Amino acid sequence: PVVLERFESAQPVVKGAVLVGAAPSSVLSGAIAQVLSNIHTDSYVGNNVALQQEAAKVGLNLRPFNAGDKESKFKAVVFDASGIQNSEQLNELYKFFNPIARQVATSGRVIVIGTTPETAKTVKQAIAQRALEGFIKSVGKEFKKGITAQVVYVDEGAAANLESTLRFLLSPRSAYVSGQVIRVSKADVVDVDWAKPLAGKTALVTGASRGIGEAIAHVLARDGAHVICLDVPQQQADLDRVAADIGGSTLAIDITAADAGEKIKAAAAKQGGLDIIVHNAGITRDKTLANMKPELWDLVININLSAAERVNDYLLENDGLNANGRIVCVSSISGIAGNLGQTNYAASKAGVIGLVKFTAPILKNGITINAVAPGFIETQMTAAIPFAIREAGRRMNSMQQGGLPVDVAETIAWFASTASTGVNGNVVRVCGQSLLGA
Amino acid sequence: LPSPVVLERFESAQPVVKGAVLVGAAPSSVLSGAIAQVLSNIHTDSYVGNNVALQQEAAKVGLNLRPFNAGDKESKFKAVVFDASGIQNSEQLNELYKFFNPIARQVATSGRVIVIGTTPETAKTVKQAIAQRALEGFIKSVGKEFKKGITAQVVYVDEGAAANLESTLRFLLSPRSAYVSGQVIRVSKADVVDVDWAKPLAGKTALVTGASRGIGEAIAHVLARDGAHVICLDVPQQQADLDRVAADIGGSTLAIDITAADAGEKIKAAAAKQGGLDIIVHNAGITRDKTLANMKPELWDLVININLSAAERVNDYLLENDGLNANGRIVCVSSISGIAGNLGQTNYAASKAGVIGLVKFTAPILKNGITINAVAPGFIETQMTAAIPFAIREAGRRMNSMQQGGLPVDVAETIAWFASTASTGVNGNVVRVCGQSLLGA
């Protein structure tokens, strides 16, 4: 299988050329062109006068790309499908993507940017914009070479809130995110140091002493945040090690305890209050329902779902998250798809999806909530999984390989970004486009 | 590897459920009366545990629930039905454990696990919405775990729509739903209309596109069995097969190209001879599988046209020209590849994802009790099955909780459930008919 390109340094965002296209009458092309100008990449365009004019109006020099050239490779191909007004115009997807379908580089990106169907002004456009997800999921399974494929839906009028999502998907940070739908909504545009998009912020990560939580802590700290590493007192040694490695601090408590939210707020006060909380703490107690003990049902629901509800409730009602704050939860593919032996775990992780979906409308003060839903992630404890599930999870995705802890951490860090003001209520799988789903 | 079990399918209108039903409910549930009324109507052996409130609500509607000894690990139940609407928060999700763990080995072969809750978007508290959302994770795991051909569903009832549950619960209790598992079905508020449950399409006229063979032919048979007069539509090239199918079911024929600009005109003109059109099933569809880099322009266009745009044009005509009678039905056909994507199917999957959008964004603007829903079939054995390699066809056979491919009748039964005169509160749903295929989004 392919070695996936992953994050090296803040610049360049994209190594290689980017080809941009757009359907007639699109409305997102200026916004796309601005991001491309912002990240200083070699950007090419085909014979599209309106698109060339939209890019010139924001200062992007688009080199024309010779439709007769079947040899040039592009690291990313980006298509503004917002102009597709009905199902007949879905052939704008073919017109752009068929000529370059062999010319996307290894570890490359296919990115389609459309209008959120629920916000489209006509039913015919909503239908066509909905169709885009079918297209990109098929592209994600067909192009190989470690290429990812995404659809970004931009709510009608939210073109200004797209930059942080476009940057994440264009970059190697998104190496294990493929086949997914991301929704961008209207929000304030905030200033941000794109090289340190968590600069000046304080984050708290539960389950931080090891594993994916430790990787989350590293990436948040890399992006500028002071990271409060949270785990049970029994892990104090690993907690100190992680906090020292990243220049953070520790809070050694049981996240499920009644006073967890209060102790989190208290500890964050010393750093100017809490900006980001990542609910990564979580366990599996895999048993068939017929063999499962009651306490093992309760335990899994408690740690994976109810404890996060209690902490969120406390912080949101008692001034425990700063303005433009961030809640990031961790669901799972099994929350979406179910799994034998996981009636308790899948119930909890589906609850997490509901926690995100029904909390996001009621949030105030620019706070957002989102979740990652990892597929098969390689950990130092992965060899403890029975071999059958283990090798299936490793292979049954478009990347033909397991993901890495850093792939989940990067996606969480994109949610946490100071610039991701208009990313709210999303659940984004980090699964290399696993075949599993709903 | 094991061999699959045989799935029980429809044999006759009664009994709805062959065997006993165990009912349970969480404390403070609000759907138990409606459920108990259905179990009464179908004259089924119904049992209950130590739930006084449930026994009393069932006694109110004339249903006598027999106590099920909680020490009895041997009795088998064809169906277990749990009212989860009383689960108010995540801590109360252990009500699922309390009911299902003691009986997890006592669901019969080809049995039914049915969880009924409150539509999360209609729940009055955020905590309840979260808990009701959690039920989908639970039932999807049950569907993969219980084996023995057992299906598992969650039916969500909009707050206040309890009286609209009956046709869905009957479909799920019955063998008609043999190949539907892992799915979420939303019931919304609507008027309740009289129906003959043995002939739930009595007096109605249906039109089925692509009716001359395959799943289209199976659809035509099931709709006619339920009492509909079926107009079988296909291209004039299939006139002989069309006449064969129409003669077998007592229907009529309409030989046109569904993509033609006047197709909706000719459909309405044809249905005039039978009292107007009540039901249209958009089953016509094609695949033209090619990698995108190898695909020809016309082969993208053709797949979008037949599978999506043609249904849009016909719907538009019928809805703008009163071509569908009140309490009418539009049933579309998507596909697992429309949900999940597939190599070689950028055109097909785009078109079938569009069908999902057609359903979702037409449903809110329908009037006069007309509904629109879609089925999304997984691996269904047909004659167009030999085209795909025996290897890839082996993948589709195994990669689902039933460990087998479905039959055309399983798709037709789900379409017939949507089309039922009684399914007034079933609107905007896309229901996979896949035996809980592993594939998804």
Give the C-alpha separation, B418 to B168, whole Å. 9
Tokens of B112: 């039914």
Interchain CB distance below 8 Å, B342 and A141: yes
Residue A335 with chain B: CB contacts under 8 Å = 137
Q: How far apart are CA B411 and CA B352, in angstroms?
A: 16
* Cβ distance of A437 and B295 shorter than 8 Å: no
Q: Do residue B357 and residue A289 have CB atoms under 8 angstroms apart?
A: no
Query: Please, are residues B331 and B281 in contact by the beta-carbon 8 Å criterion?
Result: yes
DSSP letter, residue A193? -
The amino acid at B347: N
The DSSP bridge partners found for residue B208 are B232, B281
Say how far apart CA A151 and CA A149 lie, in whole Å: 7
Comparing C-alpha atoms, which of A361, A369, A293, A363 is closest to residue A327?
A: A369
CB A133 to CB B365 under 8 A?
Answer: no
DSSP one-letter code for B311 = H
Residue A246: phi and psi, rounded to 5, are: -110, 0
Cβ–Cβ gap B130/A358 under 8 Å:
yes
Between CA A355 and CA A369 the distance in angstroms is 9
The distance of A192 to chain B (nearest Cα, Å) reads 33
Domain ranges, ordered by start, for chain B: 1-195, 196-441
Question: Does B182 sit within 8 Å of A98, measured CB to CB?
Answer: no
- For A372, phi then psi, to 5°, come to -95, 155
The Cα–Cα gap between A428 and A418 comes to 18
Tokens standing for residue A104: 């996307």
Nearest to A27 by CA among A2, A50, A3: A50
CA nearest A92: which of A59, A129, A141?
Answer: A129
Residues B311, B313, B318: CA angle, nearest 5 degrees: 95
Taking an 8 Å cut-off on Cβ atoms, the answer to whether B90 and A305 are in contact is yes
Which residue of B lies nearest to A436 if distances are taken between CA atoms?
A: B439
Residue whose tokens read 């209520």: A425
Of A140, A179, A289, the CB nearest to B104: A289
Cα–Cα distance list, B99 to A377, A413, B24, B84, B210 (Å)? 34, 40, 7, 10, 45
8 Å CB contact of B350 and A131:
yes
B341–A141 C-beta distance less than 8 A: yes
Instruction: Give the gap in angstroms from C-alpha A420 to the nearest C-alpha of chain B.
Output: 24
Round to whole Å and give the CA distance between A40 and A33. 11
Q: Give the neighbor-by-neighbor strand order of the sheet with A63-64.
A: A63-64, A43-45, A18-22, A74-80, A104-115, A148-154, A181-184
Q: Which of A289, A297, A351 sits opposite B131 (nearest CB)?
A: A351
Cα Rg for chain B, rounded, in angstroms?
Answer: 22
DSSP state of A302: I
Residues of A in contact with B343 (CB under 8 A): 138, 141-142
B131 vs A contacts (CB less than 8 Å) = 351, 354
Cβ atoms of B410 and B437 within 8 Å: the answer is no
HEC letters along A54-121? HHHHCCCCCEECCCCCCCCCEEEEEEECCCCCCHHHHHHHHHHHHHHCCCEEEEEEEEEEEECHHHCC
Active site residue A44: no
Longest dimension (CA), chain A: 66
Pick the closest to residue B420 from B202, B216, B220, B208 (CA basis): B202
Measured between beta carbons, the chain B residues lying within 8 angstroms of A292 are 97, 101
User: What distances in angstroms separate CA B133 from CA A85, A336, B164, B199, B377, one per listed residue?
Assistant: 33, 11, 20, 35, 24
Phi, psi of A232, rounded to the nearest 5 degrees: -75, 155
The residue of chain B with its CA nearest to that of A289 is B101
Burial class (CB in 10 A: 0-12, 13-18, 19+), A417: buried
Contacts of B48 (CB under 8 A, 6+ apart): B22, B23, B24, B54, B55, B58, B65, B66, B67, B68
The answer to whether A126 and A120 have CB atoms below 8 angstroms apart is yes
Among B177, B276, B188, B290, which residue's Cα sits nearest to residue B231?
B276
The letter for the amino acid at B74 is E
Which residues of chain B lie closer than 8 angstroms to A297, CB-CB? 94, 97, 101
Dihedral (Cα; A264, A266, A268, A272), 10-degree rounding: 150
Q: Is the peptide bond before B15 cis (omega within 30 degrees of 0)?
A: yes
Paired sense of beta strands A226-231 and A249-252, if any: parallel
Residues of A in contact with B304 (CB under 8 A): 87-88, 90-91
Q: State the catalytic residues of B.
A: 348
Q: What type of residue is A368?
A: T
Residues A205 and A250: their CA atoms lie apart, in Å, by 10
Alpha carbons within 13 angstroms on the beta-carbon side of residue A334 total 23
Query: What 3-state DSSP class applies to A370?
Result: strand
CA distance B362 to chain A (A): 7
A438 neighbourhood in chain B, CB within 8 Å: 136, 140, 182, 440-441
- Give the Cα separation of A308 and A327 in Å (integer): 10
* Per-position DSSP letters for B88-101, written without gaps between them: -SGGGGHHHHHHHG
Name the amino acid, one letter, at A87.
Answer: S
Distance CA A435, CA B341 (A): 9
How many C-beta neighbours within 10 Å does residue A77 have?
A: 27
Query: What was the structure determination method?
Result: X-ray
Give the best residue of B80, B97, B151, B334 to mutate against chain A (max A CB count within 10 A). B97
Where would I find the beta strands (DSSP E) of B119-244?
151-157, 184-187, 205-209, 229-234
